[PDB]
Structures are given as structure tokens and as C-alpha cells.
Amino acid sequence: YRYTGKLRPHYPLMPTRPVPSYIQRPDYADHPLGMSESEQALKGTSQIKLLSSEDIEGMRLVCRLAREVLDVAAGMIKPGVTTEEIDHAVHLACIARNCYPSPLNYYNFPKSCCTSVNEVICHGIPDRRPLQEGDIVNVDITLYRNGYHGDLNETFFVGEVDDGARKLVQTTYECLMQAIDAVKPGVRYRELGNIIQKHAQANGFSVVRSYCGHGIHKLMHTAPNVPHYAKNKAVGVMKSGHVFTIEPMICEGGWQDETWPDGWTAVTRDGKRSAQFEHTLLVTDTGCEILTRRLDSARPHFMS
């Protein structure tokens, strides 16, 4: 394999971390290939669940717990700390909140969160590489509690970073918040990508095409599919009671991605940096509720 940039995987990984049997497990947890029967059954379906009131309480709960776990990870970001150390902490923090770490064994993903450094777009595997001053790193947290998944992510600076990194991370966050601002009943899911790409393009960045935002509730990834790029073909109209993510990935260079031999790590084909933010959203009668919002600050961690 020809790597696209400077980053390399740092193996071996520590043995897979056990989740005590008292934690309730999603279906794929114990599938040999990590397939989710429940996801697949609804795979290809266009129909969007309307959450009930107990569904909404369940989503509120797991999304706030996910946020707490992301906040634990945010506090560990500094030069010299390995992404595997961050995942260890994340794994324990999930267990402490009586949650299963959703990524763990999801289609055989081997860790409890995704860590995506520099040219890694998304789904990076926590490993033995120490974070380097200058890096940008995304941590993506997904928790499962009482049948519901909650999903968020932020990009972080590792010590001092350069102007290009400041600008890419800020712009990515602005892309996300502009899209969120547009969310309310009657808006087409396909419109969000027009908004995201307009802002990215204005700032000289490109928009990843192969990964999308998604419905989420009892299933981690379900209808709707939500592209982040302009003139997409996404199907569906927003309605009060829909829950879904928006998680744009924006890049310094070109939009094209490819996958490492690990089957998960998505990287820019050109080796230039990519940043991402993600919230889980509930559409309400007036707009939407950011279920994974940071409660104890107005702002994401990079703005500290």
C-alpha cells in the first residue's frame, strides 16, 4: 500500500478491551463480523422514524452521556499522549456511565472510539502513535444505552498549530453550525450539503463525498442519509421528531478519499489535512435541539 501522507499505523494494538457483561450490548457486539442484523433489515429503506416521547428521553440521555465522554477525551489532548491512551480512558468512561462503546466491534472496528489525525478524514483507529505538537485530531464518540445510540465528534489542536490548521478547524465548525441553523420542519435533507459546500468553497476548502450524516436512534446508522456536498440526491424532508447527525468533513486539498488496508481509516488521497465536527440533532416544531451540545460552555474545545 502507498500511504497518502506522513501518518502510519503504529501496531500492535493492546488486546481488545472487555466490556463487563452488566452493560447492555447492541446486536453486533457479539456478531463474529460485527454485522448489525437490525441495521441490515432496514438497509436500503427511505422511511424515517418518528420518535416517540420515550424515544426522545432515551436519545437525550445517551447523547448527554456521549458528550460527557467526549469532554473526558478533550482534556487529554496534548503532545506525547497516544490515541490508544485516549481510547482507554474513553472506554472506561463509557463503562462508568453504564454505556457500551458503540464503535467496539461495529463491523469489527477494534476500538472504542475513532481518532483521526491530520490527513485522516474519519474512522481512525486508536494506536501507539504519540500525538505531535502541531497535529489536529478528531475524537468521535458514540455510546449505547438502553437501546439508543448517541454520536458526536470534535477536532482538537495538539499544542500550537499553524494558521492553516486554525482556519480549517474554524471553517469546519462554521460549516456544521450553518447547516444546523437551517434545520427545521419542511427543509429537505439535501439542502444541508448546499449550505456546507458554499461555506467550505468560499474558504478554499473541499468537501468529502464518501461519508454522510445519518439517522440514529435504536440503529447507529439508518435513514436518512445526509451528504455534506452540494447538489446531492438525498431523499426526504425534515419533520418534527426526526433524529439525525450532521458531520461534515472538510479538506485543505481535494475531496477524494481512500481507505487504509485496515478497512476503516479514511484518508485524503492527496495527504493534506481534514477536519470534522458532528452533532446528533432532534427536529422540533421550531427548529432543532442539539442533543450532544456542550452544557458547561457555549463553545467547542478548540475555541478555549
Ligand SMILES: CCC[C@@H](C)[C@H](N)P(=O)(O)O
Ligand atoms: C466505527 C464507526 C464509528 C462511526 C459510527 C462514527 N461515530 P460516524 O457515524 O462515522 O460518525
Ligand SMILES: [Co+2]
Ligand atoms: Co460519529
Ligand SMILES: [Co+2]
Ligand atoms: Co455519525
Ligand SMILES: [K+]
Ligand atoms: K483529521
